[PDB]
Design a protein around this ligand. Structure first.
Ligand SMILES: *[C@@H]1O[C@H](CO)[C@@H](O[C@@H]2O[C@H](CO)[C@@H](O[C@@H]3O[C@H](CO)[C@@H](O)[C@H](O)[C@@H]3O)[C@H](O)[C@H]2NC(C)=O)[C@H](O)[C@H]1NC(C)=O
Lengths: 211, 212, 215, 194, 217
């Protein structure tokens, strides 16, 4: 077993810059290293083989380097579609092993989130469960803080958050926070507010509704 | 041109067998190295098995004695029997064309193998009514197992401004997903919005109309 | 031109782990495959397995497949036989044999390693006289209730050696051993000469010089 | 009138594994003491024969097969083994009766740049039969479209070059391998010991 | 799993006479490609590791005297010790290395055949020193006899005893090729003092009638 330790874990670079990725090795593998690009929802695509050679159909802006233990993948003239998780694979000694990956983000301007709140539907309320959904739409950067305040009391333990990948258009994130409560514990309260703290907001934005 | 299309993924109980198929186009399977590579949900890539052009088979230590790689040249398909499956084996298995046991120059779309003693359950879709410029609405896909679930708006017509969040595993052991769209504050009653939720493992297709 | 030297005698309680050694020295050992042969007390030879030290390729007998583990260290030219949990059924002398290849005869053998797996604790022997009684007279000593077995009985401190019979130790139902050594002397020197049996039990450091004479 | 074992073992150069050299040895008295008393070999695994007993018997013919492989592939020179070397370059029969000898040659076969002169076969449609020698350079046809002798899509060169470099690990270092095959057919015995 | 059964279990051959041991094989042990049976013979003197004598069914190991000859083919194999020196008293095994796992024979003991010698029967009452501890040991000795077969019975007050006697036999003496047997009767002091006459009855080939040695407490 030989472990490939990539670095950094993730990166964030603007379009047109140069992205350098490092792939370390437990043991020497000579030039027997390959690089792969895996866009979200897609299979990995061969980018570099032999640690220097470029696979067919790959633009010249990609290039490989490194000799026996330290390897470098350099991507120049960054395009919005050239960003995904990049893996390095060695084939010097069996078994072949990959790296943990190295994500690449398309940086952009700071966009204030658009906050929307959705009360649970009456159809769902019949089944005995109420779901309150708070939406953060088209914001950058990814980092954001969402707090559930029911009757001005902070709630903890029933909120799950989901974040989409970077949108192809506007390169913006979107986050969903859902609060799950019983119909009983739901109608034992009046005000359901969602407070959002984001870099693009001067002050936290609160969206609330009354049952 | 090269095509690699996979099949056979789904939900299987621990200890139960499953067979993954991978039809190949663009090359002769008998004359090429072919490998199976699995990727755990939220983890990295792991090589599983390889079959040499001469027919020789090699497997990883974690899958030896349980997984078997085979090819059917008459059907141009690469198979992967799994037999004694485990919960840890739950991963997205990829079909890759190996170049001399070194690197994978072509990959298949991948299929998801879920190993759990859980029971397949259909999702329930609930509307997210728009509030009282631009407006936001969506549907709530809740309490389904196993994933994937595909969500469409107006039978694929509504594409721009659609965000479908990744599924989240609830404390009940069931998945839940939300899909939202961005539409103008006008054209609310003039246009009818319907979300098409499809859960193939449960064979559930629900078209839920959303309106205030 | 190669010789095999094994580790020393082992006395262990049941459930203990054990790892005996076998080192070869001389010209070669790159061709020599080292096997292990078990010999239970009074039984024949049982082939346990074989290993090539260079690449640690190991082949096991079906009877010993999972019960024992055979390893090696090519750095020091030494093979190993390891037990994770000993049993009384493992009480046997173990030899390591060497042949210049697989499917070849074993030409170099070790001296053997004695392994005694018992719950009996170390105890010193008790020596009692087998006093002579009514042209040839018979007398001896009785060595009883000792553990482990290595026990040395001499007469007149190694001087009297003609007509001496030291019987093999017998394992009593108490988990201990008992040995008898007797000598053959003329019925004339009973009073003129003094006979003493020298019983030594190194594991207990017990030494008894017992005088024997007619009652 | 001794057999020319030194010409094989102590050769200045060695052949690639795909084009493995074989030296037929007959009509001579063979002294193997220079081999089993040596200390330079890293692996010396004899199957069915005993090197110490080599200077005692007679055979019809003895074969010495010479080639260079990697350290990780020395294990593949054995009966019932599978791998790139054992399937496409050099295969031993399951009933093999002889010895396989290898030693590290990182000092003679590794250059500052990759030696790239020792080669092995990378692509082959079927495994090699025991003691078969394939030195074809025909372009491997990975698809249904004929290659016409030009490399490209679905058309690979069947040979690959070992990247022997002194800075690599022990596994990647070249190892010179000499395989001793003993043949005893119903014919006059020409190879004997002293 | 090739089985090897060899006969006889015990062999008695006089000094200078011929000793023959047969070894039967379940499967064939012949390598066709080399035309050599993969069977070996080993000698194990008492208290010593086995020593390889003959390999490949005919060829003897270097240093083995020319009086050890191997023979046979297929599934039938014989070991012949032409003449018999006293240094050959051991147990001989036949082992195959044709196919793993290696398997040995059950063993054949070779003793020197000598003239029928009657045992010298001696009986020893338990010592007074041992009687203090509360256990009485009565020892019956058969000093020099041949053959090794001998029946020993303990009869206390003309009553047979079971489960309180243990026997130990020496190896064949290097000069006169005689055997020594000791039977020890173990009893508690209470049981020992509940009886008067302690007899040791011995049956042997060299005795016309059983010999009884006895004493009174
Ligand atoms: C290939 O060359 C090597 C040296 O690199 C040869 O090894 C040499 O073999 C000779 C054989 O006579 C050895 O000489 C004898 O050595 C022994 C000690 O082992 C000694 O008893 C004798 O008096 C005599 O000197 C010599 O030592 C040995 N040298 C080395 C360094 O191994 C080898 O023989 C050649 N290859 C073949 C196939 O013969």
């Amino acid at each position: 077993e030989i472990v490939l330790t990539q670095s950094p874990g993730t990166l964030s670079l603007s379009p047109g810059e140069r992205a350098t990725l490092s792939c370390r090795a437990s043991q020497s593998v000579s030039s027997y290293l390959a690089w792969y690009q895996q866009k979200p929802g897609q299979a990995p695509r061969l980018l570099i083989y032999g640690a220097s050679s470029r696979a067919t159909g790959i633009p010249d802006r990609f290039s490989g380097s490194g000799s026996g233990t330290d390897f470098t993948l350099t991507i120049s003239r960054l395009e919005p579609e050239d960003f995904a998780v990049y893996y390095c694979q060695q084939y010097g000694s069996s078994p072949r092993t990959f790296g943990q990956g190295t994500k690449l983000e398309i940086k952009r301007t700071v966009a204030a989130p658009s906050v929307f709140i959705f009360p649970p539907s009456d159809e769902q309320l019949k089944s005995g469960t109420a779901s309150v959904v708070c939406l953060l739409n088209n914001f950058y950067p990814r980092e954001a803080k969402v707090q559930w305040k029911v009757d001005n009391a902070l709630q903890s333990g029933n909120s799950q958050e989901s974040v989409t990948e970077q949108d192809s258009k506007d390169s913006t994130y979107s986050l969903s926070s859902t609060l799950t409560l019983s119909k009983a514990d739901y109608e034992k309260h009046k005000v359901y507010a969602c407070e959002v703290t984001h870099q693009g907001l001067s002050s936290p934005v609160t969206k609330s509704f009354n049952r | 041109q090269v095509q690699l299309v996979e099949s056979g993924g789904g939900l299987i109980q621990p200890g139960g067998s499953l067979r993954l198929s991978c039809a190949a186009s663009g090359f002769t399977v008998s004359s090429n190295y072919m490998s199976w590579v699995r990727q755990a949900p939220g983890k990295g890539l792991e090589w599983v098995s390889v079959i040499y052009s001469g027919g020789s088979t090699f497997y990883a230590d974690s899958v030896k004695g349980r997984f078997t790689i085979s090819r059917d040249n008459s059907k141009s398909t690469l198979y992967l029997q799994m037999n004694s499956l485990r919960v840890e084996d739950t991963a997205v298995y990829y079909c890759a064309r190996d170049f001399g046991d070194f690197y994978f120059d072509y990959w298949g779309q991948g299929t998801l193998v879920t190993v759990s003693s859980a029971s397949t359950k259909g999702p329930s879709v609930f509307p997210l009514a728009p509030s009282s410029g631009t407006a936001a609405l969506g549907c709530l896909v809740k309490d389904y197992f196993p994933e994937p679930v595909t969500v469409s708006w107006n039978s694929g017509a509504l594409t721009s401004g659609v965000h479908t969040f990744p599924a989240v595993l609830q404390s009940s052991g069931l998945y839940s997903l939300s899909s939202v769209v961005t539409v103008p504050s006008s054209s609310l009653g003039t246009q009818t919005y319907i979300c098409n939720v499809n859960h193939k493992p449960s064979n559930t297709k629900v078209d839920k109309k959303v309106e205030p | 031109q190669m010789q095999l030297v094994q580790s020393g005698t082992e006395v262990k309680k049941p459930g203990e782990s054990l790892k005996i050694s076998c080192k070869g020295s001389g010209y070669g050992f790159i061709t020599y495959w080292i096997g292990w042969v078990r010999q239970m007390p009074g039984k024949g030879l049982e082939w346990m397995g074989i290993i090539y030290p260079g690449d640690s390729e190991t082949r096991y007998s079906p009877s010993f497949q999972g019960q024992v583990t055979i390893s090696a260290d090519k750095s020091i030219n030494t093979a190993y036989l390891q037990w994770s949990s000993l049993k009384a059924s493992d009480t046997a002398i173990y030899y390591c044999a060497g042949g210049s290849g697989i499917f070849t005869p074993m030409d170099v053998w070790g001296q053997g390693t004695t392994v005694a797996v018992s719950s009996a604790s170390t105890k010193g022997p008790s020596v009692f006289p087998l006093a002579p009684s009514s042209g040839t007279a018979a007398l001896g000593c009785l060595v009883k209730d000792y553990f482990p077995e290595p026990v040395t009985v001499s007469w007149n401190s190694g001087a009297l050696t003609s007509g001496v019979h030291t019987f093999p130790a017998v394992l009593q139902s108490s988990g201990l051993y008992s040995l008898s050594s007797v000598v053959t002397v003329p019925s004339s020197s009973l009073g003129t000469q003094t006979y003493i049996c020298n019983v030594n039990h190194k594991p207990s450091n017990t030494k008894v010089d017992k005088k024997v004479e007619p009652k | 009138n001794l057999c020319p074992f030194g010409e094989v073992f102590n050769a200045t150069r060695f052949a690639s594994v795909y084009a493995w050299n074989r030296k037929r040895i007959s009509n001579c008295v063979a002294d193997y003491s220079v081999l089993y008393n040596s200390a330079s070999f890293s692996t010396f695994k004899c199957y069915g024969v005993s090197p110490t007993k080599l200077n005692d018997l007679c055979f019809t013919n003895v074969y010495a097969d010479s080639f260079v492989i990697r350290g990780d592939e020395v294990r593949q020179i054995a009966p019932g083994q599978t791998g790139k070397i054992a399937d496409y370059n050099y295969k031993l029969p399951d009933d093999f009766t002889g010895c396989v000898i290898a030693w590290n040659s990182n000092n003679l076969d590794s250059k500052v740049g990759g030696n790239y002169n020792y080669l092995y076969r990378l692509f082959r449609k079927s495994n090699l039969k025991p003691f078969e020698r394939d030195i074809s350079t025909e372009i491997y046809q990975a698809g249904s479209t004929p290659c016409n002798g030009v490399e490209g899509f679905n058309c690979y060169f069947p040979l690959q070059s070992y990247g022997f470099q002194p800075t690599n690990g022990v596994g990647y270092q070249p190892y010179r391998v000499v395989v001793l095959s003993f043949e005893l057919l119903h014919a006059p015995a020409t190879v004997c010991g002293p």
